[PDB]
Amino acid sequence: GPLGSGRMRVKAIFSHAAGDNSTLLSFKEGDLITLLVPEARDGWHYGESEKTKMRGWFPFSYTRVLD
């Protein structure tokens, strides 16, 4: 597809706090996250916060897929 297409985003419907751990992504409810891998692994997805531009793994269950 055209370069830049295929983006998938989710909306945080619960907040998630990484703590002192750069592998995990923090976000507040309402933040949008662009997925950067094709599937969740063991219930964890990986993406980038629209608000903070940080990246990391998070519980997929804390979000819902935007359509």
Ligand X SMILES: O=C(O)CN(CCN(CC(=O)O)CC(=O)O)CC(=O)O
For ligand X, which residue of 11, 44, 48, 62 counts as binding (CB under 6 A)?
11
Residue with smaller CB distance to ligand X, 42 or 67: 67
Give backbone dihedrals phi and psi of 52, rounded to 5 degrees, phi first: -105, -15
Question: Does position 67 bind ligand X by CB under 6 A?
Answer: yes
Task: Please tell me the distance from the alpha carbon of residue 64 to that of residue 57, in angstroms, as a whole number.
Answer: 15
Ordered strands of the 32-35 beta sheet: 55-59, 44-49, 32-35, 9-12, 63-65
Question: Does position 7 bind ligand X by CB under 6 A?
Answer: no
Task: Output the residue with the shortest Cβ distance to ligand X.
Answer: 66
Question: Does position 66 bind ligand X by CB under 6 A?
Answer: yes
Q: Interface with ligand X by CB under 6 A: which residues?
A: 11, 66-67
